[PDB]
PDB file of C-alpha atoms in Angstrom:
ATOM      1  CA  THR A  24      12.610  15.184  -7.468  1.00  0.00           C
ATOM      2  CA  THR A  25      15.194  16.974  -4.608  1.00  0.00           C
ATOM      3  CA  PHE A  26      16.048  14.716  -1.881  1.00  0.00           C
ATOM      4  CA  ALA A  27      13.050  15.728   0.421  1.00  0.00           C
ATOM      5  CA  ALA A  28      10.779  15.744  -2.337  1.00  0.00           C
ATOM      6  CA  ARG A  29      11.169  11.984  -3.009  1.00  0.00           C
ATOM      7  CA  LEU A  30      11.537  11.960   0.626  1.00  0.00           C
ATOM      8  CA  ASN A  31       8.640  12.776   1.903  1.00  0.00           C
ATOM      9  CA  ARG A  32       6.563  11.488  -0.725  1.00  0.00           C
ATOM     10  CA  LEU A  33       7.409   7.838   0.599  1.00  0.00           C
ATOM     11  CA  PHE A  34       6.234   9.265   3.952  1.00  0.00           C
ATOM     12  CA  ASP A  35       2.869   9.805   2.331  1.00  0.00           C
ATOM     13  CA  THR A  36       1.957   7.287   0.453  1.00  0.00           C
ATOM     14  CA  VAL A  37       3.494   4.011   1.613  1.00  0.00           C
ATOM     15  CA  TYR A  38       2.562   2.444   5.232  1.00  0.00           C
ATOM     16  CA  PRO A  39       0.527  -0.234   6.667  1.00  0.00           C
ATOM     17  CA  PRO A  40      -2.960  -0.903   5.950  1.00  0.00           C
ATOM     18  CA  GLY A  41      -5.728   0.112   8.797  1.00  0.00           C
ATOM     19  CA  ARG A  42      -2.991   2.572   9.598  1.00  0.00           C
ATOM     20  CA  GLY A  43      -1.979   5.814   8.884  1.00  0.00           C
ATOM     21  CA  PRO A  44       1.725   6.843   7.666  1.00  0.00           C
ATOM     22  CA  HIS A  45       4.444   6.383   9.627  1.00  0.00           C
ATOM     23  CA  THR A  46       6.007   9.545  11.541  1.00  0.00           C
ATOM     24  CA  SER A  47       9.446  10.643  11.060  1.00  0.00           C
ATOM     25  CA  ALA A  48      10.427   9.459  14.909  1.00  0.00           C
ATOM     26  CA  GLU A  49       8.729   5.804  14.005  1.00  0.00           C
ATOM     27  CA  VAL A  50      11.754   5.797  11.598  1.00  0.00           C
ATOM     28  CA  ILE A  51      14.232   7.171  13.763  1.00  0.00           C
ATOM     29  CA  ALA A  52      12.726   4.688  16.189  1.00  0.00           C
ATOM     30  CA  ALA A  53      13.413   1.468  13.300  1.00  0.00           C
ATOM     31  CA  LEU A  54      16.473   2.677  12.786  1.00  0.00           C
ATOM     32  CA  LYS A  55      17.855   2.300  15.990  1.00  0.00           C
ATOM     33  CA  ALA A  56      15.812  -1.391  16.070  1.00  0.00           C
ATOM     34  CA  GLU A  57      18.375  -2.294  13.558  1.00  0.00           C
ATOM     35  CA  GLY A  58      21.174  -0.129  15.097  1.00  0.00           C
ATOM     36  CA  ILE A  59      21.707   3.290  13.245  1.00  0.00           C
ATOM     37  CA  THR A  60      22.040   6.216  14.995  1.00  0.00           C
ATOM     38  CA  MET A  61      20.446   9.024  12.574  1.00  0.00           C
ATOM     39  CA  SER A  62      19.472  12.087  14.909  1.00  0.00           C
ATOM     40  CA  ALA A  63      15.923  12.840  14.658  1.00  0.00           C
ATOM     41  CA  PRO A  64      15.842  16.403  13.605  1.00  0.00           C
ATOM     42  CA  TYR A  65      18.419  15.075  11.024  1.00  0.00           C
ATOM     43  CA  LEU A  66      15.413  13.714   9.387  1.00  0.00           C
ATOM     44  CA  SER A  67      13.729  16.861   9.925  1.00  0.00           C
ATOM     45  CA  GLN A  68      16.301  19.057   8.568  1.00  0.00           C
ATOM     46  CA  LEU A  69      16.360  16.664   5.157  1.00  0.00           C
ATOM     47  CA  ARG A  70      12.475  16.507   5.253  1.00  0.00           C
ATOM     48  CA  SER A  71      12.585  20.407   5.028  1.00  0.00           C
ATOM     49  CA  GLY A  72      15.426  21.009   3.110  1.00  0.00           C
ATOM     50  CA  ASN A  73      18.070  23.052   5.195  1.00  0.00           C
ATOM     51  CA  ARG A  74      21.054  20.715   3.802  1.00  0.00           C
ATOM     52  CA  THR A  75      20.051  17.994   1.146  1.00  0.00           C
ATOM     53  CA  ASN A  76      22.455  15.774  -0.279  1.00  0.00           C
ATOM     54  CA  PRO A  77      23.062  13.000   2.076  1.00  0.00           C
ATOM     55  CA  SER A  78      25.051  10.246   1.911  1.00  0.00           C
ATOM     56  CA  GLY A  79      24.511   7.117   0.176  1.00  0.00           C
ATOM     57  CA  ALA A  80      24.124   5.050   4.240  1.00  0.00           C
ATOM     58  CA  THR A  81      21.903   7.945   4.959  1.00  0.00           C
ATOM     59  CA  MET A  82      20.024   7.075   1.891  1.00  0.00           C
ATOM     60  CA  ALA A  83      20.061   3.408   1.804  1.00  0.00           C
ATOM     61  CA  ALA A  84      18.832   3.219   5.313  1.00  0.00           C
ATOM     62  CA  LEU A  85      15.761   4.578   4.816  1.00  0.00           C
ATOM     63  CA  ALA A  86      15.297   3.416   1.119  1.00  0.00           C
ATOM     64  CA  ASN A  87      15.604  -0.165   3.141  1.00  0.00           C
ATOM     65  CA  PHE A  88      13.348   1.198   5.912  1.00  0.00           C
ATOM     66  CA  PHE A  89      10.237   1.602   3.427  1.00  0.00           C
ATOM     67  CA  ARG A  90      11.684  -1.762   1.756  1.00  0.00           C
ATOM     68  CA  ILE A  91      12.316  -0.177  -1.824  1.00  0.00           C
ATOM     69  CA  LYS A  92      15.643   0.269  -3.428  1.00  0.00           C
ATOM     70  CA  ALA A  93      17.530   3.417  -2.879  1.00  0.00           C
ATOM     71  CA  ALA A  94      17.540   3.510  -7.082  1.00  0.00           C
ATOM     72  CA  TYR A  95      14.411   5.539  -5.745  1.00  0.00           C
ATOM     73  CA  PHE A  96      16.411   8.380  -4.613  1.00  0.00           C
ATOM     74  CA  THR A  97      19.310   8.713  -7.299  1.00  0.00           C
ATOM     75  CA  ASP A  98      18.219   7.314 -10.506  1.00  0.00           C
ATOM     76  CA  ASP A  99      15.732   9.749 -12.018  1.00  0.00           C
ATOM     77  CA  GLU A 100      14.128   7.013 -14.080  1.00  0.00           C
ATOM     78  CA  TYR A 101      13.458   4.205 -11.106  1.00  0.00           C
ATOM     79  CA  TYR A 102      11.661   7.004  -9.526  1.00  0.00           C
ATOM     80  CA  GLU A 103       9.457   7.408 -12.630  1.00  0.00           C
ATOM     81  CA  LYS A 104       9.141   3.562 -13.163  1.00  0.00           C
ATOM     82  CA  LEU A 105       8.089   3.646  -9.588  1.00  0.00           C
ATOM     83  CA  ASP A 106       5.804   6.562  -8.764  1.00  0.00           C
ATOM     84  CA  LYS A 107       2.723   5.014 -10.634  1.00  0.00           C
ATOM     85  CA  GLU A 108       2.005   1.922  -8.563  1.00  0.00           C
ATOM     86  CA  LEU A 109       3.329   4.532  -5.624  1.00  0.00           C
ATOM     87  CA  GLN A 110       0.619   7.425  -7.043  1.00  0.00           C
ATOM     88  CA  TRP A 111      -1.235   4.496  -7.475  1.00  0.00           C
ATOM     89  CA  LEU A 112      -1.642   3.552  -4.133  1.00  0.00           C
ATOM     90  CA  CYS A 113      -2.863   7.102  -2.897  1.00  0.00           C
ATOM     91  CA  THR A 114      -5.119   6.739  -5.469  1.00  0.00           C
ATOM     92  CA  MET A 115      -7.000   3.569  -3.807  1.00  0.00           C
ATOM     93  CA  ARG A 116      -7.008   4.922  -0.413  1.00  0.00           C
ATOM     94  CA  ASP A 117      -9.352   7.436  -1.710  1.00  0.00           C
ATOM     95  CA  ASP A 118     -13.114   6.819  -1.109  1.00  0.00           C
ATOM     96  CA  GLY A 119     -14.971   8.035  -3.956  1.00  0.00           C
ATOM     97  CA  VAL A 120     -12.736   6.256  -6.472  1.00  0.00           C
ATOM     98  CA  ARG A 121     -13.338   3.244  -3.877  1.00  0.00           C
ATOM     99  CA  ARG A 122     -16.688   3.638  -4.485  1.00  0.00           C
ATOM    100  CA  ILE A 123     -16.788   4.297  -7.749  1.00  0.00           C
ATOM    101  CA  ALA A 124     -14.817   1.164  -8.660  1.00  0.00           C
ATOM    102  CA  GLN A 125     -16.978  -0.748  -6.381  1.00  0.00           C
ATOM    103  CA  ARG A 126     -20.243   0.172  -8.117  1.00  0.00           C
ATOM    104  CA  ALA A 127     -18.888   0.314 -11.926  1.00  0.00           C
ATOM    105  CA  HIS A 128     -17.104  -3.427 -10.961  1.00  0.00           C
ATOM    106  CA  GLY A 129     -20.559  -4.818 -12.246  1.00  0.00           C
ATOM    107  CA  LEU A 130     -21.302  -3.199 -15.303  1.00  0.00           C
ATOM    108  CA  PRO A 131     -20.346  -5.063 -18.749  1.00  0.00           C
ATOM    109  CA  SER A 132     -17.073  -3.890 -20.137  1.00  0.00           C
ATOM    110  CA  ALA A 133     -19.028  -2.021 -22.954  1.00  0.00           C
ATOM    111  CA  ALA A 134     -21.089  -0.090 -20.444  1.00  0.00           C
ATOM    112  CA  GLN A 135     -17.757   0.606 -18.192  1.00  0.00           C
ATOM    113  CA  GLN A 136     -16.413   2.025 -21.084  1.00  0.00           C
ATOM    114  CA  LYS A 137     -19.024   5.134 -21.036  1.00  0.00           C
ATOM    115  CA  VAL A 138     -18.363   5.277 -17.567  1.00  0.00           C
ATOM    116  CA  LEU A 139     -14.561   5.772 -18.581  1.00  0.00           C
ATOM    117  CA  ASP A 140     -15.878   8.324 -21.155  1.00  0.00           C
ATOM    118  CA  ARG A 141     -18.175   9.964 -18.896  1.00  0.00           C
ATOM    119  CA  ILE A 142     -15.191   9.970 -16.531  1.00  0.00           C
ATOM    120  CA  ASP A 143     -13.236  12.205 -19.513  1.00  0.00           C
ATOM    121  CA  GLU A 144     -16.291  14.470 -19.874  1.00  0.00           C
ATOM    122  CA  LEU A 145     -16.006  15.957 -16.428  1.00  0.00           C
ATOM    123  CA  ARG A 146     -11.978  16.372 -15.983  1.00  0.00           C
ATOM    124  CA  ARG A 147     -12.257  18.350 -19.787  1.00  0.00           C
ATOM    125  CA  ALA A 148     -15.255  20.226 -18.001  1.00  0.00           C
ATOM    126  CA  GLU A 149     -13.041  20.816 -14.999  1.00  0.00           C
ATOM    127  CA  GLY A 150     -10.349  21.756 -16.801  1.00  0.00           C
ATOM    128  CA  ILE A 151      -8.339  19.440 -15.605  1.00  0.00           C
ATOM    129  CA  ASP A 152      -7.862  18.376 -19.071  1.00  0.00           C
TER     130      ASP A 152
ATOM    131  CA  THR B  24      -9.267 -19.382   8.659  1.00  0.00           C
ATOM    132  CA  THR B  25      -6.826 -20.292  10.968  1.00  0.00           C
ATOM    133  CA  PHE B  26      -3.343 -19.050  11.664  1.00  0.00           C
ATOM    134  CA  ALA B  27      -1.579 -21.080   9.026  1.00  0.00           C
ATOM    135  CA  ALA B  28      -3.935 -19.370   6.530  1.00  0.00           C
ATOM    136  CA  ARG B  29      -4.080 -15.921   8.295  1.00  0.00           C
ATOM    137  CA  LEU B  30       0.125 -16.086   7.979  1.00  0.00           C
ATOM    138  CA  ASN B  31      -0.750 -17.202   4.459  1.00  0.00           C
ATOM    139  CA  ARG B  32      -2.972 -14.498   3.663  1.00  0.00           C
ATOM    140  CA  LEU B  33      -0.617 -11.721   4.680  1.00  0.00           C
ATOM    141  CA  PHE B  34       2.201 -12.909   2.601  1.00  0.00           C
ATOM    142  CA  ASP B  35      -0.034 -12.421  -0.306  1.00  0.00           C
ATOM    143  CA  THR B  36      -1.473  -8.879   0.791  1.00  0.00           C
ATOM    144  CA  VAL B  37       0.717  -7.266   2.670  1.00  0.00           C
ATOM    145  CA  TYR B  38       4.090  -6.430   0.362  1.00  0.00           C
ATOM    146  CA  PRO B  39       5.824  -3.579  -0.874  1.00  0.00           C
ATOM    147  CA  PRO B  40       5.493  -1.297  -3.775  1.00  0.00           C
ATOM    148  CA  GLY B  41       6.994  -2.466  -7.354  1.00  0.00           C
ATOM    149  CA  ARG B  42       7.771  -5.730  -5.748  1.00  0.00           C
ATOM    150  CA  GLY B  43       6.504  -9.364  -5.240  1.00  0.00           C
ATOM    151  CA  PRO B  44       4.894 -11.107  -2.035  1.00  0.00           C
ATOM    152  CA  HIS B  45       7.411 -11.046   0.686  1.00  0.00           C
ATOM    153  CA  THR B  46       9.593 -14.407   1.371  1.00  0.00           C
ATOM    154  CA  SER B  47       9.957 -16.534   4.499  1.00  0.00           C
ATOM    155  CA  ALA B  48      13.189 -15.972   4.382  1.00  0.00           C
ATOM    156  CA  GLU B  49      13.748 -12.433   3.783  1.00  0.00           C
ATOM    157  CA  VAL B  50      11.249 -12.499   6.744  1.00  0.00           C
ATOM    158  CA  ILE B  51      13.704 -14.569   9.145  1.00  0.00           C
ATOM    159  CA  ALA B  52      16.616 -12.317   8.074  1.00  0.00           C
ATOM    160  CA  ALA B  53      14.855  -9.067   8.506  1.00  0.00           C
ATOM    161  CA  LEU B  54      14.207  -9.879  12.476  1.00  0.00           C
ATOM    162  CA  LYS B  55      17.498 -11.244  12.659  1.00  0.00           C
ATOM    163  CA  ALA B  56      18.628  -7.893  11.735  1.00  0.00           C
ATOM    164  CA  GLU B  57      16.784  -6.145  14.751  1.00  0.00           C
ATOM    165  CA  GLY B  58      18.657  -8.462  16.734  1.00  0.00           C
ATOM    166  CA  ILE B  59      15.549 -10.809  16.847  1.00  0.00           C
ATOM    167  CA  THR B  60      16.242 -14.542  16.041  1.00  0.00           C
ATOM    168  CA  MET B  61      13.743 -17.271  14.699  1.00  0.00           C
ATOM    169  CA  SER B  62      13.727 -20.791  13.017  1.00  0.00           C
ATOM    170  CA  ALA B  63      13.479 -21.516   9.434  1.00  0.00           C
ATOM    171  CA  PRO B  64      11.666 -24.640   9.487  1.00  0.00           C
ATOM    172  CA  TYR B  65       9.670 -23.576  12.496  1.00  0.00           C
ATOM    173  CA  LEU B  66       8.168 -21.071  10.138  1.00  0.00           C
ATOM    174  CA  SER B  67       7.769 -23.338   7.418  1.00  0.00           C
ATOM    175  CA  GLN B  68       6.022 -25.920   9.295  1.00  0.00           C
ATOM    176  CA  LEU B  69       4.315 -22.994  11.055  1.00  0.00           C
ATOM    177  CA  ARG B  70       3.008 -21.936   7.378  1.00  0.00           C
ATOM    178  CA  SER B  71       2.452 -25.960   7.064  1.00  0.00           C
ATOM    179  CA  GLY B  72       0.469 -25.694   9.981  1.00  0.00           C
ATOM    180  CA  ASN B  73       2.977 -28.763  10.823  1.00  0.00           C
ATOM    181  CA  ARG B  74       3.060 -26.514  14.370  1.00  0.00           C
ATOM    182  CA  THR B  75       0.449 -24.034  15.588  1.00  0.00           C
ATOM    183  CA  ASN B  76      -0.458 -22.197  19.056  1.00  0.00           C
ATOM    184  CA  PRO B  77       2.815 -20.258  18.631  1.00  0.00           C
ATOM    185  CA  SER B  78       4.625 -18.151  21.360  1.00  0.00           C
ATOM    186  CA  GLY B  79       2.372 -14.922  22.050  1.00  0.00           C
ATOM    187  CA  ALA B  80       6.149 -13.088  21.498  1.00  0.00           C
ATOM    188  CA  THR B  81       6.265 -15.510  18.395  1.00  0.00           C
ATOM    189  CA  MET B  82       3.215 -13.745  16.589  1.00  0.00           C
ATOM    190  CA  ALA B  83       4.075 -10.113  18.128  1.00  0.00           C
ATOM    191  CA  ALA B  84       7.573 -10.300  16.311  1.00  0.00           C
ATOM    192  CA  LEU B  85       5.875 -11.457  12.727  1.00  0.00           C
ATOM    193  CA  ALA B  86       3.055  -8.968  13.058  1.00  0.00           C
ATOM    194  CA  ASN B  87       5.876  -6.445  13.610  1.00  0.00           C
ATOM    195  CA  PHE B  88       7.406  -7.273  10.392  1.00  0.00           C
ATOM    196  CA  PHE B  89       4.278  -7.270   8.212  1.00  0.00           C
ATOM    197  CA  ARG B  90       3.781  -3.707  10.122  1.00  0.00           C
ATOM    198  CA  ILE B  91       0.303  -4.931  11.048  1.00  0.00           C
ATOM    199  CA  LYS B  92      -1.149  -5.332  15.078  1.00  0.00           C
ATOM    200  CA  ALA B  93      -1.010  -8.755  16.176  1.00  0.00           C
ATOM    201  CA  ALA B  94      -4.560  -8.778  16.876  1.00  0.00           C
ATOM    202  CA  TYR B  95      -4.918 -10.049  13.326  1.00  0.00           C
ATOM    203  CA  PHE B  96      -4.296 -13.795  14.405  1.00  0.00           C
ATOM    204  CA  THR B  97      -6.242 -13.392  17.372  1.00  0.00           C
ATOM    205  CA  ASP B  98      -8.569 -10.637  16.838  1.00  0.00           C
ATOM    206  CA  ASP B  99     -10.965 -11.558  14.215  1.00  0.00           C
ATOM    207  CA  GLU B 100     -12.894  -8.134  14.560  1.00  0.00           C
ATOM    208  CA  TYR B 101      -9.414  -6.500  13.111  1.00  0.00           C
ATOM    209  CA  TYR B 102      -9.295  -9.118  11.078  1.00  0.00           C
ATOM    210  CA  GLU B 103     -12.472  -8.961   8.862  1.00  0.00           C
ATOM    211  CA  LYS B 104     -12.071  -4.961   9.337  1.00  0.00           C
ATOM    212  CA  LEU B 105      -8.678  -6.123   6.837  1.00  0.00           C
ATOM    213  CA  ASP B 106      -8.556  -9.083   5.143  1.00  0.00           C
ATOM    214  CA  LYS B 107     -11.902  -7.878   2.978  1.00  0.00           C
ATOM    215  CA  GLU B 108     -10.753  -4.461   2.891  1.00  0.00           C
ATOM    216  CA  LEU B 109      -7.410  -6.287   1.755  1.00  0.00           C
ATOM    217  CA  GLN B 110      -9.047  -8.097  -0.772  1.00  0.00           C
ATOM    218  CA  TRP B 111     -10.118  -5.116  -2.397  1.00  0.00           C
ATOM    219  CA  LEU B 112      -6.554  -5.159  -4.653  1.00  0.00           C
ATOM    220  CA  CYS B 113      -7.392  -8.054  -7.030  1.00  0.00           C
ATOM    221  CA  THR B 114     -10.761  -6.729  -7.943  1.00  0.00           C
ATOM    222  CA  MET B 115      -9.628  -3.383  -8.021  1.00  0.00           C
ATOM    223  CA  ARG B 116      -6.090  -3.778  -9.868  1.00  0.00           C
ATOM    224  CA  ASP B 117      -5.192  -4.376 -13.563  1.00  0.00           C
ATOM    225  CA  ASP B 118      -9.325  -4.835 -14.331  1.00  0.00           C
ATOM    226  CA  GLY B 119      -9.801  -1.995 -16.461  1.00  0.00           C
ATOM    227  CA  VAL B 120     -11.265  -0.560 -13.886  1.00  0.00           C
ATOM    228  CA  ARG B 121      -7.766   0.448 -12.868  1.00  0.00           C
ATOM    229  CA  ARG B 122      -8.135   3.494 -15.321  1.00  0.00           C
ATOM    230  CA  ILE B 123     -11.671   4.172 -14.116  1.00  0.00           C
ATOM    231  CA  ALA B 124     -10.584   4.499 -10.896  1.00  0.00           C
ATOM    232  CA  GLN B 125      -6.907   6.415 -11.576  1.00  0.00           C
ATOM    233  CA  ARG B 126      -8.470   8.672 -14.143  1.00  0.00           C
ATOM    234  CA  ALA B 127     -11.417   9.341 -11.393  1.00  0.00           C
ATOM    235  CA  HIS B 128      -8.907  10.478  -8.921  1.00  0.00           C
ATOM    236  CA  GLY B 129      -8.182  13.906 -10.060  1.00  0.00           C
ATOM    237  CA  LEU B 130     -11.834  14.795 -10.378  1.00  0.00           C
ATOM    238  CA  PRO B 131     -13.604  17.078  -7.394  1.00  0.00           C
ATOM    239  CA  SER B 132     -15.360  16.216  -4.586  1.00  0.00           C
ATOM    240  CA  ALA B 133     -18.902  17.174  -6.719  1.00  0.00           C
ATOM    241  CA  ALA B 134     -17.426  15.452  -9.726  1.00  0.00           C
ATOM    242  CA  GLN B 135     -17.119  12.121  -8.617  1.00  0.00           C
ATOM    243  CA  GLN B 136     -20.410  12.028  -7.569  1.00  0.00           C
ATOM    244  CA  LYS B 137     -21.873  12.931 -11.395  1.00  0.00           C
ATOM    245  CA  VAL B 138     -20.007   9.874 -11.855  1.00  0.00           C
ATOM    246  CA  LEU B 139     -21.608   7.831  -8.954  1.00  0.00           C
ATOM    247  CA  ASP B 140     -24.752   8.891 -10.356  1.00  0.00           C
ATOM    248  CA  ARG B 141     -23.964   7.737 -14.218  1.00  0.00           C
ATOM    249  CA  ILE B 142     -23.147   4.440 -13.087  1.00  0.00           C
ATOM    250  CA  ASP B 143     -26.859   3.615 -11.705  1.00  0.00           C
ATOM    251  CA  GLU B 144     -28.093   5.552 -14.758  1.00  0.00           C
ATOM    252  CA  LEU B 145     -26.096   2.732 -16.493  1.00  0.00           C
ATOM    253  CA  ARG B 146     -27.026  -0.283 -14.191  1.00  0.00           C
ATOM    254  CA  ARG B 147     -30.770   0.808 -14.765  1.00  0.00           C
ATOM    255  CA  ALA B 148     -29.910  -0.124 -18.579  1.00  0.00           C
ATOM    256  CA  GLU B 149     -29.651  -3.738 -16.908  1.00  0.00           C
ATOM    257  CA  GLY B 150     -31.703  -3.813 -14.300  1.00  0.00           C
ATOM    258  CA  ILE B 151     -31.783  -1.970 -10.674  1.00  0.00           C
TER     259      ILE B 151
END
């Protein structure tokens, strides 16, 4: 929940289909495309963490870039109100979870539950739980 | 499957997190902000299909907004490779499968397999 934390978070979960995440320069690019002078290193130093605490414009820019609200960055709660769906994304990019979802999509609720229950058996078994 | 639909297919699949599908108006405005200009009711009739076969450049600026490639409208290869994969959501979203899918993410490589195995063990109990 540093700046660079929630920032990179975006960088790793929000991006167009058939496609990987945006580059820093891809962001910088879009930033000049709406007329915004942010130095490309000024992205890096902030993603690394060399001097956190950026200004609101500096924040609202890249919130509006990813097309989410900058309350994400400020309000610790919206961060959490969001991150659910936001995590949820990097969930469904996972083959395995895909395969599973696919297969178990045709069982009855009753049988799909055993799956859910079987799932639990294995997280416990891994020390996940 | 025609532009008026392919463009309508996009508003209803591609939209940002914690957000509703994209709006035509906010589509026009967002382009304008680039310095890029486009009519409101052109698009409206465009989406109605009351004016098809648009500028090669009209398609581009428009894909650019949705952050996808322009081929989505021309190239059906890229398309089917998408919208059916874009069709993943509603079938794999809010189903109850939601939890099954989101619990299962944490799992290790071997574990997910045991779950794949467990499913056929359950399908078999019906017919497979």
